[PDB]
């Protein structure tokens, strides 16, 4: 059949949404097959990629933010549900842009790769500090001058006195496919890709 893997997050809703809005047997029960013959698995983003990587599945639904930071790259990014409004951005205190830093900028982010790559292009050297969650505390508690995180409505930031100092990239869910699968199952794969792109 066709094996899929979905990120348990808010993405799992975007997918089940599109799948249904494209005519596919859906059932949100707890932990799975479908009539359309789609074996589906769920888990965290880095685990969706891990599963697709080890050819455990053929298709996967993850976010650009995960695909960017993740060092894995051996996949095909066919479809792209532009459904959303998240974006990578360098947030900080208003005065950030004006304050002169003698020493290098300390940035706290959940995505060190994305942060190191953004500042690469900006021709600036920084010191990255890894934080797994509420990166807002980073600058608040005094661990970093600024942060690089996913900003959507801007609320979390504004509710701490921070503000988007500059946008990096737009975040959204992507349908990634295992290269080997695409090559020998190009059928069902392309079909679904079309059935989901008009949906």
């Amino acid at each position: 059949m066709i094996k899929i893997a979905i990120t348990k997050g808010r993405i799992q809703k975007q997918v089940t949404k599109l799948l249904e809005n494209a005519d596919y047997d859906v059932e949100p029960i707890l932990n799975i097959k479908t009539k359309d013959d789609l074996q589906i698995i769920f888990g965290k983003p880095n685990d969706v990629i891990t599963f697709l990587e080890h050819g455990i599945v053929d298709i996967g639904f993850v976010g650009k933010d995960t695909l960017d930071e993740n060092d894995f790259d051996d996949y095909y990014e066919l479809l792209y549900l532009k459904i959303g409004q998240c974006i990578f951005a360098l947030a900080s205190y208003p005065d950030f842009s004006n304050k002169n830093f003698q020493r290098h900028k300390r940035i706290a982010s959940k995505y060190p790769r994305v942060t190191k790559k953004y500042f690469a292009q900006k021709q600036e050297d920084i010191e990255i500090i890894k934080l797994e969650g509420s990166v807002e505390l980073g600058p608040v508690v005094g661990l970093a001058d600024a942060i690089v995180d996913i900003v959507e409505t801007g609320n979390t930031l504004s509710a701490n006195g921070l503000e988007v100092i500059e946008k990096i990239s737009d975040i959204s869910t992507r349908m990634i496919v295992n290269k080997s699968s695409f090559k020998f199952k190009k059928d069902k794969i392309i079909e679904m890709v079309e059935r989901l792109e008009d949906a």
């Binding site: 790259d73 295992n178 020998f184």
Partner: protein
């Protein structure tokens, strides 16, 4: 005990498969008059000029930088250089290369022979080789570096960018890309297609419609190969293929097995390398990635 993250370990059975296949491939190769050559295990880091990060290296007492055999094609090309009178040459090799991450390879190189004749010889032979491996499901694909480049120039010449689009088959990125540059209806229709189809009928049209010579030209060459070889095995033309090395002249080919993610065989034309030592000639050969074929034979079994 522990083992180097680079040291590989083959099971007693894998060595049997590996040795069986070679035995078969040796007859085939020698049946086609291909002489086996065993390149030195040490080479001057200098030679590998055509990323030192993946190389095992060192200095000598003499005070030079040497590198463990990193590639099979270059050495053999050097060897073809030595030959005083310019005549044809068929070399085969059975061993491994050292990169950082077994990497046992089996390949052949054709030097000196006439152009068109060589390309069929090598393509033909690559198809015979695949049919000695024991892999049940495999596809063989051909591409053209000339069609690749001509495609990058006509695409606002943004070669570096499209190269990244094709590699990830980033359909959406492509769409945005075709947006920023007001591309002709034809070039558009083509770039969107070559990304996800190999249906010769569909692609032929798209290509001819661009009314571009170099493109229809290169497509036509692959179309012949497709037809002349189609009997041996159904060929597949991948116009979205990204040349594996920057020195690929035109013809290039990969072969895959449903049982493995990497290619079990890859190769192509690269007259360019021949110029580094001697003068212009026809140089073409392929390489079989044994570690991947063996892996495939295992998965397939289950």
């Amino acid at each position: 005990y522990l083992l180097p993250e680079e040291s590989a370990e083959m099971t007693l059975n894998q060595v049997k498969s590996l040795r069986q296949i070679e035995g078969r491939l040796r007859k085939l190769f020698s049946l086609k008059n291909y002489q086996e050559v065993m390149p030195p295990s040490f080479e001057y880091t200098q030679l590998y000029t055509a990323n030192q990060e993946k190389m095992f290296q060192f200095i000598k007492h003499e005070g030079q930088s040497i590198t463990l055999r990193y590639d099979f094609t270059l050495p053999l090309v050097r060897l073809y250089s030595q030959i005083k009178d310019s005549t044809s040459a068929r070399y085969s090799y059975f061993g491994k290369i050292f990169r950082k991450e077994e990497n046992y390879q089996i390949g052949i190189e054709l030097f000196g022979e006439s152009a068109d004749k060589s390309e069929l010889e090598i393509l033909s032979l690559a198809l015979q080789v695949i049919e000695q491996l024991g892999l049940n499901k495999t596809v063989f694909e051909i591409g053209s570096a000339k069609f690749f480049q001509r495609l990058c120039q006509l695409a606002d010449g943004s070669t570096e960018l499209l190269t990244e689009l094709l590699l990830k088959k980033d359909l959406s990125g492509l769409n945005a890309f075709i947006e920023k540059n007001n591309f002709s209806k034809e070039l558009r229709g083509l770039l969107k297609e070559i990304f996800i189809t190999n249906e010769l009928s569909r692609l032929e049209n798209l290509v001819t419609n661009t009314k571009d010579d170099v493109l229809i030209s290169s497509f036509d060459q692959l179309k012949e190969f497709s037809e002349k070889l189609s009997m041996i095995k159904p060929i597949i033309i991948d116009l979205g293929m990204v040349p594996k090395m920057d020195y690929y002249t035109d013809l290039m080919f990969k072969a895959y097995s449903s049982a493995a993610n990497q290619p079990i065989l890859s190769g192509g034309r690269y007259d360019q390398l021949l110029s580094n030592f001697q003068e212009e000639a026809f140089a073409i050969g392929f390489c079989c990635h044994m570690d991947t074929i063996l892996k495939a034979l295992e998965r397939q079994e289950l």
